């Protein structure tokens, strides 16, 4: 963690770099009922969705965690 | 802080000098070498004045004669906040950095920038937190009661403070510190309420604290170069920082110095075993000393008229004459029996070892016979033999047992030379069978 | 811990530093994939690669790898 | 039944309480003074006060130098760390040898930490998210919160999850009816398995069925961990374990060794000193063993001169079998055991001696006892005479072909004819050299 | 106060208007012919017409070569690029040495750009976007202590505004030409909406909302080559954490250099730019391989090559990378055929005394005249650099005994404490065990 | 412009007749008639283009004109023909093998010629109207574009509509669309709207509105080397490797496929093959492996004509332990033809110095020219060539517009040549660092 005492711009920049919505949306997926809500009850087409599901799958179910 | 077991130079707390730069016979763990200590005090005043830059000082002498200990005394007498980079000679032969780049990074880690800034903090003990939330969480109303030993207050809380308080969960009786601008809340622990443990703060709640930062030039060079972030200061893969960013940093530091926003502090770069460097490193050092942003370089070597690395000729101290022309040489001497006895006494008091007087005389005799470091090493293994037979003070026969068990160099060379058929020679010829 | 002076005088633009001016000068005005100044190179590269838009090289050359 | 390989007949130094070595106990025969010196070194390591001490084991080939180091490692116990090295392992193509030596130096300092974990666990019963106002607003995620209903034994809790926690939740592919395990220290989620309260035999994904967790959903537990300083160094150098973008991308890239700067080591030392001062940590220094030390060159020796003078470095044990050999990386210097004199001045040499006929005979007897073979007395005398005549190792390695040749003749004992046939079938170094001298076309 | 490091008593060549060197001028003592030749070279560089001209100045150690090069750099001024270099810096482990040589060649050709900086700053009082899902424009009304100002903005700047999370009452910073948006903080008028808050509060700007300024940008061709040849891609303005993939140096092709030259030549003809060639200075030129010496012959025949200045202190020495090639100054004869050689002569006693007095004056030290002749005799007996480096221990030892003037006892004490190379060598020969 | 007066910029082609007979002084070249005739023969061999894989060797003493001859061949070759000029030290790379670097240098010197047609509609967008069907399966577009003279209405396909959503237009941006190809680009904003939005932004740029005919027809001709095709087909986005050099050992199967498709395009008639010249200056620092690779690579059909220049005597071949003529092995010299060069005399030196003084805008008197000619007879030629330009600055500092004998004498006294420096080193060698590292610093013994 890098801190600058008495500045709010550095906190916003660090929170944008660590938790970038585009990359974090690329490394995950939207829930199914949320996808149904935006595609049908909001009129958003499928091609205007953010990119999801680019995390590579592990070998097993056991290989997905360190606990 | 600064965890450490016991070092080989842990008994040295600094140079033993008075106000007139004269060495005491025994002070701050240093015994003997009065001329070397006086010269190192002059170099210390050279560093502390800070009005000149780029001077080379060579410390040369026989092995195991106070060479690294002088540098440790200088570094201990320098104090905090002044940089001190201590590298070895063979450390600059990298695989992803050139030798001149590694030398430049070692040079620019010894110049610091002093910046003073003031912040506002709120530190106190939490009395009561009252949070009112809606069903959907669209709005939240908050009241926080916080106190010190001298005042009590209640704050009306905003949305972002409420979200920053439910994160990093705080309860009653905690002692916390809040920065208003950045929103960072640090839990310092719990107060003295049994119902880790930290005494309640006193005085005003909102204090104005000024902190003084010391940032090396290499950190600004890494940060200003946009190819890698600040994490390269820890991972170490900076990877050949260019020169235009260094020029920009130099011009900006010179611009900050005129307006009083920053101060230049110089440090000491210590290069132990300087004879291991290559000729190209010497040629880079010949021009790196002629810059305004250059520290004071201390080099140590024990070679006498050795072959310069990367060449085919022999040079004094293993260094070419161009580097020796730019340097002033401090020479160390060998020790008498009284200096060896005093050093062994200090090393005995450092390791919490009780020595008898006859054992000290035997250790001094076998120190002036073979080496100082052998007799220094014998004490800690003689103490285990003393403790094995359930005795506290180290006696004569314990030192004799340690002399019998662990060999020195001169006995091992003779034992090798009498039985040369049992060891592998330079031709790879050995004999393993006993008979024939 | 980083001092505030370094951040406000070396990263963010203000009235006394030229971060934004030099950024626009190096990355936009003097870019060799600019169709306003290097249309022949863009046409040659579009014939070579088969791209249907001549602004694709300027777009590709100024984005990070992960976003690309 | 069991696997034996050139060792494992040795269980320790075999000393009494006064440090006096017995003639034959603990799997050792002879070498009384070296074993007593190694016992003194073992007591010095167990004192846990010194730093940067070093000894050197000097002797001929096949005399018991590696055996003494393994006996030291067995006498210390498994809690004290022990890092065995060969001299050829320090030359890597990814990073310089100096960093590899410092890595092996930091790999031999242990630490024991009592660690407290905040744990939410239970069975997932309700998994309900709710949406944002403008999902295509560019900034902010698609959802805002996720409601998770957890049920444990004698308890039930509901949680409103942050989306960042929900990324790790949905990366584990949890569902309704699964027993999960959330670690609040790092945000890591472990999916244990399907609950056994529902049916079992209607699955096709070979899952594991687990009962409900005992106790409440929210817990705090204390865990004792064993961690070396090098582990902390490589954890902070390549950060994997967060829930951010950088920590997520750190697990997918190919790992590579990097030159860890001294600033990170100073920060790790400061944090470990704070942990020790808080009373939750205990420092366990160890032993670094570098066998075949003559393979090192002058640069690693010169860096080792500096590295032994730090205040953290552990006890270093070296070994060599050279008489008067030029140091590698030099041209004309000559030093005992291939070790330069400035490094020799900081050592404590432990001499090792060759064996006799009777010691060879009882070593052969014990190694035949370990390998579960029955040897006749005349065959044992012939094997001892062969060991004196050629090599101890040659008489050691001829036991198992003799056992195979005895077993092919439907016998249990080993007799003289099997030893003669193993002599005729298998050769030693001297006879092969004598054949090569009287050879036709470089045989 | 002021830091002096082996130089900075040199402010120029000390020539007159006719190019004749005065004896003591510009901090230079003696050395008339080398200073006059360097003045001729300075005039040739200021002519700005020729490409690839190379000179070499050779002499003994500690004779004034690097001082002459820095005097040339001081004579040319700060607007002319000057790239110092040592010969050992060309051996990098990331790219070949010829690529590094071409990089240092193109680092010494500069450009001058006339630019205009326009800045709006102040408190936001109105933020009304207008559409025609796509915003047509946005109207922003700023406010400072001298009044208000209402601006229209395209949606591209509006996307950067909502990137910065800007609401009503924040103090912002908008650059007109580049479109940069920076949020400074919330205004002090909204500091009492809550007792405890996360936002930081700043006062109103006391100046006007609209500010204009004329600036001059100095760049080199190497900066444009680097900016056009990023291998991974572009970068954002703010990146506190680096890229996940490490970008190393690459062998930049000739085609990129040709395209950069074409773009710069197009921009020069409109009067936007101005081309200033500079000096590439390489010290210790005898530490170069024969391959770099061969590639220097090709690089010196280009159309854009700057003036190259080399230094060497070797005699008849074997070239590095060869076995049986003996050439003067460690420089191969095919290269030697392409330069002009300037000889640099040593010093006698009185110039050594005068240089010692000059360095004592610069370092703010007072030396008695009795100690000055002893220091000059010491300098003639051992080395000039040994006499120059002994001034500060003498000053410290004089200041220790509460004296502000150098007394010859301090010079004797500093001679006793610190040795030179010859006495240390005599200790080395008359010793038993490794000094 | 971005070109200063280089070492040999006065040479514009070989000074030859129509019967390949060299004139004594024409096109900036003086003397060397046999080498000029041989270079004319090689130039006609290149211009014929039916002979592939020939190696010639320009050998001579230093400062004779081998690189001047190569520059003259390059200038007389004309444009749109690839002429690669590399040194011998450039192929020792860290990310590429010497074989791969030599293969890339070989394939950079042979190209193909492609001609295409363009129907450019360049203008400023006035207003765009999009018609969407009720089903939504197709989108219709009415585009109103204009120049400064006239304006028309165009109907648009759905691919135009999706291509104009990307790099979006805002009714006043200058675009240019092809008819047959349909390439879409956005040049920037018009100058008429420069006082509208009060702040420019990041990517925007202001261009003038195009004038005249809206629909233009233009034929352009491209020349692409084979190496560019290799780099393009090696990756997914290959032009970044074309401009940053990060190709990294392209495989052989893509080269075979590219050779086969080049032969197929030549047979069809889409493209024609333009050969070229590869010039390897200072060939004597190449390894023996590079020489063997050159021996094998010279026998392929897609090989250029290789020009090699060297000035070594009987010297050691690098990578071996023996000596050889020109520093080259004998099997490489077998498959080659040698053009030799001869040293100059007083008159050709005087003519070369006069031409170089004419090029550098320096006026000399006759006596100064004769003094420089005598110096170039005694010393080398490049010494006098540098003496001219420094004597010009001395004369300008003397407030005179002409260079006289006193300025030449002052420049002779100030700047030394090789022989005087050798004599001065050999007279005072105790002050210089010799090969053993011994030097005397102090002046008093
Ligand atoms: N004057 C002194 N005071 C205290 N300890 C000393 C002194 N001189 C030498 N020593 C001790 O002798 C040992 C060798 O010193 P050192 O200078 O490190 O060896 P070397 O000369 O090989 O560098 C050190 O452990 C140091 O503690
Ligand atoms: N005192 C001993 N008692 C029993 N076995 C021994 C003894 N000394 C050596 N050995 C055996 O001799 C072999 C060689 O010893 P080791 O130390 O591994 O190699 P070296 O002596 O060549 O370094 C080992 O397999 C070990 O089992
Ligand atoms: N004419 C002069 N006047 C004043 N100082 C000089 C003069 N000549 C040399 N010096 C000084 O003597 C030193 C010589 O250093 P330098 O020129 O770098 O040595 P070298 O010529 O071996 O590179 C410099 O510190 C310079 O300040
Ligand atoms: N025939 C010629 N006509 C005009 N100039 C020449 C001629 N030959 C040589 N030169 C000039 O001599 C200078 C050096 O010749 P160069 O070609 O470098 O010799 P080399 O071929 O031995 O390297 C060049 O600047 C060139 O202009």
UniProtKB/Swiss-Prot annotation, chain C:
It is found in: Nucleus. Coiled coil: none annotated. Belongs to the SNF2/RAD54 helicase family. The DBINO region is involved in binding to DNA. Component of the chromatin-remodeling INO80 complex, at least composed of ARP4, ARP5, ARP8, RVB1, RVB2, TAF14, NHP10, IES1, IES3, IES4, IES6, ACT1, IES2, IES5 and INO80. Present with 1110 molecules/cell in log phase SD medium. ATPase component of the INO80 complex which remodels chromatin by shifting nucleosomes and is involved in DNA repair. Its ability to induce transcription of some phosphate-responsive genes is modulated by inositol polyphosphates. The INO80 complex is involved in DNA repair by associating with 'Ser-129' phosphorylated H2A histones as a response to DNA damage. This is Chromatin-remodeling ATPase INO80. The lineage of its organism: Eukaryota, Fungi, Dikarya, Ascomycota, Saccharomycotina. The chain holds residues 1084 to 1151 of 1489 of the full protein.
Swiss-Prot record, chain D:
It is found in: Nucleus. The keyword Transcription applies. ATP binds at residues 59-66. SUPFAM superfamilies: P-loop containing nucleoside triphosphate hydrolases. GO terms for cellular component: chromatin; Ino80 complex; NuA4 histone acetyltransferase complex; nucleus; R2TP complex; Swr1 complex; TTT Hsp90 cochaperone complex. Its main location: nucleus. It catalyses: ATP + H2O = ADP + phosphate + H(+). Present with 11600 molecules/cell in log phase SD medium. Belongs to the RuvB family. DNA helicase which participates in several chromatin remodeling complexes, including the SWR1 and the INO80 complexes. The SWR1 complex mediates the ATP-dependent exchange of histone H2A for the H2A variant HZT1 leading to transcriptional regulation of selected genes by chromatin remodeling. The INO80 complex remodels chromatin by shifting nucleosomes. Its ability to induce transcription of some phosphate-responsive genes is modulated by inositol polyphosphates. The INO80 complex is involved in DNA repair by associating to 'Ser-129' phosphorylated H2A histones as a response to DNA damage. This is RuvB-like protein 1.
Curated annotation (Swiss-Prot), chain F:
It comes from the Eukaryota. Its EC number is 3.6.4.12. Keywords: Activator, ATP-binding, Chromatin regulator, DNA damage, DNA repair, Helicase, Hydrolase, Nucleotide-binding, Nucleus, rRNA processing, Transcription, Transcription regulation. It catalyses: ATP + H2O = ADP + phosphate + H(+). One of its GO terms (cellular component) is TTT Hsp90 cochaperone complex. Present with 3030 molecules/cell in log phase SD medium. Belongs to the RuvB family. Probably forms a homohexamer. Interacts with RVB1 and may form heterododecamers with RVB1. Component of the SWR1 chromatin remodeling complex composed of at least ACT1, ARP4, RVB1, RVB2, ARP6, YAF9, VPS71, VPS72, SWC3, SWC4, SWC5, SWC7 and SWR1, and perhaps BDF1. Component of the chromatin-remodeling INO80 complex, at least composed of ARP4, ARP5, ARP8, RVB1, RVB2, TAF14, NHP10, IES1, IES3, IES4, IES6, ACT1, IES2, IES5 and INO80. Also belongs to the R2TP complex composed of at least RVB1, RVB2, TAH1 and PIH1. Interacts with SPT15/TBP. This is RuvB-like protein 2. The lineage of its organism: Eukaryota, Fungi, Dikarya, Ascomycota, Saccharomycotina. The gene is RVB2.
């Amino acid at each position: 963690t890098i801190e600058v005492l008495g500045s709010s711009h550095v906190t916003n920049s660090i929170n944008n770099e660590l938790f970038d919505p585009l990359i974090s949306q690329a490394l995950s997926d939207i829930p199914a009922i949320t996808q149904y809500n935006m595609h049908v009850k909001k009129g958003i087409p499928v091609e205007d969705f953010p990119k999801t599901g680019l995390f590579p799958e592990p070998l097993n179910k056991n290989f997905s965690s360190n606990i | 802080k600064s965890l450490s077991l016991i070092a080989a130079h842990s008994h040295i707390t600094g140079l033993g000098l008075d106000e007139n730069l004269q060495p005491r016979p025994t002070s701050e763990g240093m015994v003997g070498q009065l001329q070397a200590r006086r010269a190192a005090g002059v170099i210390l005043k050279m560093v502390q004045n800070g009005t000149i830059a780029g001077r080379a000082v060579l410390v040369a002498g026989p092995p195991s004669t106070g060479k690294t200990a002088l540098a440790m005394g200088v570094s201990q007498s320098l104090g905090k906040d002044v940089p001190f980079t201590a590298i070895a000679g063979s450390e600059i032969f990298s695989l992803e950095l050139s030798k001149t780049e590694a030398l430049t990074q070692a040079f620019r880690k010894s110049i610091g920038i002093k910046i003073k800034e003031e912040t506002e903090l709120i530190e106190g003990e939490v009395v009561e937190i009252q949070i009112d939330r809606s069903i959907t969480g669209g709005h939240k109303q908050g009241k926080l009661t916080i106190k010190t030993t001298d005042m009590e207050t209640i704050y009306e809380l905003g949305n972002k403070m409420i979200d920053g308080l439910t994160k990093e969960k705080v309860l009653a009786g905690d002692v916390i510190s809040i920065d208003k601008a950045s929103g960072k809340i640090t839990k310092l622990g719990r107060s003295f309420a049994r119902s880790r443990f930290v005494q309640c703060p006193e005085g005003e709640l909102q204090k104005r604290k000024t902190v003084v930062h010391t940032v090396s030039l290499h950190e600004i060079d890494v940060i200003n170069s946009r190819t890698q972030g600040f994490l390269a200061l820890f991972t170490g893969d900076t990877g050949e920082i260019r020169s235009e960013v260094r020029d920009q940093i130099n011009t900006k530091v010179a611009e900050w110095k005129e307006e009083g926003k920053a101060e230049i502090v110089p440090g000491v770069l210590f290069i132990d075993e300087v004879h291991m460097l290559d000729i190209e490193c010497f040629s880079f050092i010949n021009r790196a000393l002629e810059d305004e942003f250059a520290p004071i370089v201390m080099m140590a070597t024990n070679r006498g008229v050795s072959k310069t690395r990367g060449t085919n000729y022999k040079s004094p101290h293993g260094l070419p004459l161009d580097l020796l022309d730019r340097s002033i040489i401090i020479t160390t001497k060998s020790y008498n029996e009284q200096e060896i006895k005093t050093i062994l006494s200090i090393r005995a008091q450092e390791e919490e070892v009780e020595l008898s007087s006859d054992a000290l005389d035997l250790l001094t005799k076998t120190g002036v016979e073979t080496s100082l470091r052998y007799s220094s090493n014998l004490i800690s293994v003689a103490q285990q033999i003393a403790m094995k037979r359930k005795n506290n003070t180290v006696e004569v026969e314990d030192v004799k047992r340690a002399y019998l068990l662990f060999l020195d160099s001169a006995r091992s060379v003779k034992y090798v030379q009498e039985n040369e058929s049992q060891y592998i020679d330079d031709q790879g010829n050995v004999q393993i069978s006993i008979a024939k | 811990s980083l001092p505030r002076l370094i951040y406000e005088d070396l990263i963010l633009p203000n009235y006394n530093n030229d971060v934004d001016i030099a950024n626009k000068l190096k990355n936009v005005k003097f870019n060799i994939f600019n169709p306003s100044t290097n249309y022949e190179l863009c046409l040659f590269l579009s014939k070579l690669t088969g791209e249907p838009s001549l602004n694709e090289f300027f777009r590709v050359s100024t984005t990070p790898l992960l976003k690309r | 039944v069991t696997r034996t390989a050139a060792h494992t007949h040795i269980k320790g130094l075999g000393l009494d309480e006064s440090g006096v070595a017995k003639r034959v106990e603990g799997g050792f025969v002879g070498q009384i003074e070296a074993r007593e010196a190694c016992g003194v070194i073992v007591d010095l390591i167990k004192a846990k006060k010194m730093s940067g001490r070093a000894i050197l084991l000097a002797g001929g080939p096949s005399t018991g130098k590696t055996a003494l180091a393994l006996a030291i490692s067995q006498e210390l116990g498994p809690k004290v760390p022990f890092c065995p090295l060969v001299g050829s392992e320090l030359y890597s193509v990814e990073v310089k040898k100096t960093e590899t030596l410092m890595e092996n130096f930091r790999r031999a300092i242990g630490l024991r930490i009592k660690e407290t974990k905040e744990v939410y666990e239970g069975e997932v019963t309700e998994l309900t998210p709710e949406d944002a106002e403008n999902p295509l607003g560019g900034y902010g995620k698609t959802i805002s919160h996720v409601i998770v209903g957890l049920k444990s034994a004698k308890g039930t809790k509901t949680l409103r999850l942050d989306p960042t926690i929900y990324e790790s939740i949905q990366r584990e592919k949890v569902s309704i009816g699964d027993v999960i395990y959330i670690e609040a220290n790092t945000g890591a989620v472990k999916r244990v398995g399907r609950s056994d309260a529902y049916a079992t035999e209607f699955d096709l994904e070979t899952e594991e069925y687990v009962p409900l967790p005992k106790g409440e959903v929210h817990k705090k537990k204390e865990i004792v961990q064993d961690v070396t300083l090098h582990d902390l160094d490589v954890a902070n150098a390549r950060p994997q374990g967060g829930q951010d973008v950088i920590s997520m991308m750190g697990q997918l890239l190919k790992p590579k060794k990097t030159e860890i700067t001294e600033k990170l080591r100073q920060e790790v030392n400061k944090v470990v000193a704070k942990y020790i001062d808080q009373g939750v940590a205990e420092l366990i220094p160890g032993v670094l063993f570098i066998d075949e030390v003559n393979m090192l060159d002058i640069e690693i020796f010169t860096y080792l001169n500096k590295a032994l003078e730090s205040n953290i470095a552990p006890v270093v044990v070296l070994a060599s079998n050279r008489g008067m050999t030029t140091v590698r990386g030099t041209e004309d210097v000559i030093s005992p055991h291939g070790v330069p004199p400035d490094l020799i001045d900081r050592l404590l040499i432990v001499r090792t001696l060759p064996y006799d006929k009777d010691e060879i005979r009882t070593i052969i007897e014990r190694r035949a006892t370990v390998e579960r073979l029955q040897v006749e007395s005349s065959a044992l005398d012939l094997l001892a005479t062969m060991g004196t005549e050629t090599s101890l190792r040659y008489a050691l390695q001829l036991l198992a072909p003799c056992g195979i040749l005895a077993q092919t003749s439907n016998r249990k004992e080993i007799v003289v004819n099997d030893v003669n046939e193993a002599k005729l079938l298998f050769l030693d170094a001297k006879r092969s050299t004598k054949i090569l001298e009287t050879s036709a076309n470089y045989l």
